[PDB]
Ligand binder design. Structure first.
Ligand SMILES: CCn1cc(-c2cccc(C(F)(F)F)c2)c2sc(/C(N)=N/C3CCS(=O)(=O)CC3)cc2c1=O
Ligand SMILES: [Cl-]
Length: 119
């Protein structure tokens, strides 16, 4: 049922989520938990939305997911002041995530998918 691409996106997703032990990124940010968020942040992103995009075959490439991942962390490092727990969690998630999605493994994951496609 799952495409090799979807299986690889889901695998990366599980890896990234483990770098969010507080689960601050698990669900869309609500205005209750972050007053005014809907008024300020232009392109909200969270893991649950990323997961639904993979399940719904919306991702065309690993790089799209990576872009969504970076957006998600940057939104959090803008909306929140540096001294906050959310900023600190976002900085760590971003640094760890950029190793999980480093340019090296994303395109060597993709040519392995392509290699297997050609066997
Ligand atoms: C990282 C995305 N994100 C997530 C949350 C969030 C989600 C679920 C549960 C909780 C918590 F209540 F358990 F902590 C937080 C929040 S909450 C929030 C919030 N209230 N931020 C204020 C902190 C002081 S401020 O920096 O002056 C301005 C905004 C921003 C985010 C966020 O970006
Ligand atoms: Cl790390």
């Amino acid at each position: 049922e799952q495409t090799p691409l979807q299986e690889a996106l889901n695998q990366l997703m599980r890896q990234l989520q483990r770098k969010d032990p507080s689960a601050f990124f698990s669900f869309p940010v609500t205005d209750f938990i972050a007053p005014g968020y809907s008024m300020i942040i232009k392109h909200p992103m969270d893991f649950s939305t990323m997961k639904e995009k993979i399940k719904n075959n919306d991702y065309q490439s690993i790089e799209e997911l990576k872009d969504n991942f970076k957006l998600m962390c940057t939104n959090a490092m803008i909306y929140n002041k540096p001294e906050t727990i959310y900023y600190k969690a976002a900085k760590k998630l971003l640094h760890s995530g950029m190793k999980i999605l480093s340019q090296e493994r994303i395109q060597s994951l993709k040519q392995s998918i392509d290699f297997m496609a050609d066997l």
